[PDB]
Amino acid sequence: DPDKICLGHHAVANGTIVKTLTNEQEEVTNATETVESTSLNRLCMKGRNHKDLGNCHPIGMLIGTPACDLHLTGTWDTLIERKNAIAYCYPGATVNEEALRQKIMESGGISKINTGFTYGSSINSAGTTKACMRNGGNSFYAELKWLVSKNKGQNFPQTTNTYRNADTAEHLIMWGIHHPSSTQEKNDLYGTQSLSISVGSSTYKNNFVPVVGARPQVNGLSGRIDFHWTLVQPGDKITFSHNGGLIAPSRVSKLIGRGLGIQSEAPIDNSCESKCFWRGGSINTRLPFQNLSPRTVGQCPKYVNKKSLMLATGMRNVPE
Amino acid sequence: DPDKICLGHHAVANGTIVKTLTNEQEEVTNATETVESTSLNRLCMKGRNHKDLGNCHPIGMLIGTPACDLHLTGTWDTLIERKNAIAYCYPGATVNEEALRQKIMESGGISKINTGFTYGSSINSAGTTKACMRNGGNSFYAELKWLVSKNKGQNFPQTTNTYRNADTAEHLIMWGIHHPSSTQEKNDLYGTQSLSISVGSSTYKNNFVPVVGARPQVNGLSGRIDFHWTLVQPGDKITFSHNGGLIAPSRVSKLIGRGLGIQSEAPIDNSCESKCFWRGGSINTRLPFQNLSPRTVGQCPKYVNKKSLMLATGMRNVPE
Amino acid sequence: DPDKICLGHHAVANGTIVKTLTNEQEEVTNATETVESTSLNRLCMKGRNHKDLGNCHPIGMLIGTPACDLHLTGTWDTLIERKNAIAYCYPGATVNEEALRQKIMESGGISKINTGFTYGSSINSAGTTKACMRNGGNSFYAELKWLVSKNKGQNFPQTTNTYRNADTAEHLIMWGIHHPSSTQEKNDLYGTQSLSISVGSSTYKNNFVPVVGARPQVNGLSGRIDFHWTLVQPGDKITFSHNGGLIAPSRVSKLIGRGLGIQSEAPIDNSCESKCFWRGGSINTRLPFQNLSPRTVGQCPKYVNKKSLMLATGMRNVPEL
Amino acid sequence: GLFGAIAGFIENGWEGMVDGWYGFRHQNAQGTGQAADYKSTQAAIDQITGKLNRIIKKTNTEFESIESEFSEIDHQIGNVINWTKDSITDIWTYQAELLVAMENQHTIDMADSEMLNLYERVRKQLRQNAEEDGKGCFEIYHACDDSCMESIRNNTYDHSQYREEALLNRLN
Amino acid sequence: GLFGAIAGFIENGWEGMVDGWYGFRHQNAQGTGQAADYKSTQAAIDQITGKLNRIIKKTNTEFESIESEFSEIDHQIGNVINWTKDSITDIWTYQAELLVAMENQHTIDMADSEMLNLYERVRKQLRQNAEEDGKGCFEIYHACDDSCMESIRNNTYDHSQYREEALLNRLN
């Protein structure tokens, strides 16, 4: 007999499952994903003055390995490092290597300044090696000089070289120490005297003695040249005191501004833009979380140990 | 005279206090603890192929200190280190000691491989000391050999020994350098010549020179034997070039797989299982949080600065 | 007509905007700030036995640089380091310098203990320099002695000095190596003999050789005195064997307990109190968060990347038309 | 649920209501009708849009690499980084889980409250002219044509117009 | 509290009700009785069980040592580790305290709502045959024997059976 008005709410045939504080299997009308599972298999470089180093390793830019001849100076906001890139043509390594690599990979450019180092007539400063080929001929790291006695067997003279930082910004200076494979080789290059290299400034102090001894050939060579580095502040002097074994800098480096360092094998794409990168490529999602990798760079969604996390965008679904 | 039906809720005599967003002293019918504050003063090792090192320090396993004679090789998924464990019998220390200890404590076993190093007839390779007692008397580190001149005062011969890794996994090589108590002692053992020990692989190089400056006696001995170590990759060689002062390896080590390192003072219990350990024992709780210690290893509840946090499991308690 | 009773709630003319889970622009009757934006540009030291080092660098306290003469010993709960503080009067530097500074800035005091080192007739232990002025005269690091030959030219004798730690706590011992400016200078102070300094304890050993040669003048001086340090354990001894070049300790140091190290240029204020400090001063707030600096020490509000976060302390404001 | 309407005294949702989240169905002498309620529907949608605007977001903090992809880093430092990164990941995984669980509970209960508030608004409009059946409907004790039904939906229904007729029918 | 029933218009709980969380007491000619309501009780317990399943959990992340119990590590990295671990502990301590405070607020208010939802169900069942007491009771304006009281509890009370006479008793 009475007329009737009924209050109700919508429903859908295919609801979605979400988790609440009290229920792991709560069916709602709609929901949306908060964890990103996909990435673009490319480095999205639109809006970035980027440098793809190819097979040049960042440290190779400072010392001047032949692979890095086109990357000795420049400017950039993004620096891309690739797998198996070359830093050391001659067998060896850098002391405090990762600190240096990260420093270069957050710069926005490199400039080179001459040390102005000259050497006496009893020093051959043009030592080369078959490990570092340039134009089909034996060469050496472009920013350094392999110093040896000009006459074979003769005592390398006590030498002093001082670089003044005349610039208003700090300069990064590198040098190497040669480690002969035998007593004969050491005597031929530097003489029979005890070898000592000291490097000193107001902000740095260290001593190096060439290691002489038999060891396995690396690319047919038992010798080693290990690299060392430090910063020279504006107005400060850094002095090298050496009598054999020093691989001396002919230029120093100036790191300019800021940039984002990316390590990835993914190909470049100038069409797309991104702010988040990882080994496998670019993450352009708007979502707050991601499950692709705990190792990302830039402005990124936070990594989580979750396949999916659904946020309800509707009421409980209560079908007919 | 109306009949009636009354709606109501339960209550309890012994209510319990919880904290809410708005009330510190909220009485509810029931609650349960979320922070574990009790521990088992025992290392729960059921289901674990474990090794309790006792008074043997992990580094002593590699060099073969008498305290570690029962732990020269082994397999395990869990390695237990004890307080005041012995690494060295003769006075001295390992360079880069903590990294070595941690690396051993990350392993699932140790195997030993003969170097096969041989020496000329003018070398005594069976040097021993009162500091390292084994069985009847004066002995040495089991995995090393103290090389001295057979004839007292004679120059130790220039010797070369090379170990190739013939395995498919990396080997950990250790050696020592003896630093004599005086010039006279140095001359007696190795002769009057300048001593030089050079070590070299594809990835490692170093020079060592025995030091003879006056220093105090440790258990009656002013001499020191310091240890050095490196990893040799599959197929690579490590060459020792020396003329007195080298404590040479008789065997090298292979760290097998991975395992959980525990540093604890608690005794073993093979009746109980656990995945979370600390200095004082094991944490077997189901609870999310824990107030025992910020230093734990394994799969653990999170440390919090709180004795108790009660989670309500019932309504407000409202008695008559 | 029925009589009426109406239920209502208050409102205000000037509501405040807050953010909720669902609304960025929610007007409420009242709110309060949770993020502190203001700092006192002053180091609030009320209720603290504090030491302001001023122009004295922490390492200068141990070697006894003239600027540190009033900071050679003492006790403190808070130690304040200033910018451009002086550690070294003579040219040179300490090996493992930052670790030493950190260790001192973690301490709650310093005591000094005599080494008891003595020297024969041929050693002049009172070497001084114009680089280290004190009372208008040439002086030296208060806790060290510059040993030279008494007769200029003569060989500095082979010498042994051993310090035993007779205390129940570890002692920090420092020494210097003089690196002469020329071969001529080396010969005048220590003689023509080749120089070598050995240092040996139960837990430490090292060898040092005076490197001789010309180098840039720091305040008209090419010579250097570089410093080294180690810890001597309770009951252990440390032996110096030397024949020229050693700058020997006359006292060793004992770091007492723990204290809060602060690095700041802000002036001291004993009127205000605080438990949180940073380069620019003190944060006295009761609030849970702050946006002044991510670089703070003490018991502090947590740094957040937010200018303001308003917590509602009232209902929705629904004003009248 | 918290407010007792959705998955509560309202038995189920309407699949055939495709132009709104909440609404009305009626029956009177002339026939039947259906209409969505715009205000309550929009109130629910706007609150959910607010959550999405807050949640679908990343920080603008620029992070650099501290782990080399193509070279070995120091073992002690690597262990510290691994401990720290895994700790940070446990925190974010936990925060993510809690955020979405908490928000999902609130979204569901908020939607329930909007249903109840519409129901309550209608109850108070009808006053003594109707009675609740317990299923989310009101039995109206007077002739209520399509115009009358529209006035209930659009909040312009004047109870005093029908009160005399309605009270007589209710008491019977 | 939020829903006004528990510690609200219901003055206190019943310690004698040991077979449920919510329920009924009644009065009629035949005497008095008590009975728990299973459905409301189980709704509250199931929701609390859901929280426990969520919360009483640890992560499955494997952590290894970055601090030596029995020896000294490098002082610089040790200070970084101490800063990091203490920062992590402050976060988890804060998260733990907020989690439990928020969950306890919700548990209490959820339980309050389940009481009100039962109360509201009974109100709508009784329709015009009863009036609210103000303290959680309904005064029923007709004779309601044990089978009638049971019909209210098990949700099968038909108001139309008693309506005619109930209305007359109310108007008097």
Place this chain on the structure above:
Amino acid sequence: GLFGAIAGFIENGWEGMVDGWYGFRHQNAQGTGQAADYKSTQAAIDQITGKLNRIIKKTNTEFESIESEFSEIDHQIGNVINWTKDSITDIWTYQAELLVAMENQHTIDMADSEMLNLYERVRKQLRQNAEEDGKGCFEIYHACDDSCMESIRNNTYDHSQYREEALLNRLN
């Protein structure tokens, strides 16, 4: 809002009610009057004071320097510290934002519930002697002088005293 009263069926607040958060306005033959409700006001204030006591605090963990202000740090270790500190700050910023958004939501809805609970209390007291107008008022169907109005505000109004005359006026 969640409970439908504040910014709901109560059209707006009263700027002139300066001595309470919730209260009453009446109209009878003697005129009008206003009065705050102490108990509901204090219930809301106490809950907000509760939140302030929990939120307005810092941890007592003493942190020391791991970054030198006046000297350089190793670039690798400096980068680890920077990553860690920035990761910690992102967590605390997120946590702060979530805390205050969640608390603000609850504070507003709590205040709404206290308004509704006062309304519901008055509704049940008045019983069959008054009717709701839908705007937060009760039309009382008997002469209710200042002392009668006071008894409603003070929770001592006896519905049975006025029932006979009230029902006659409601039925007309």
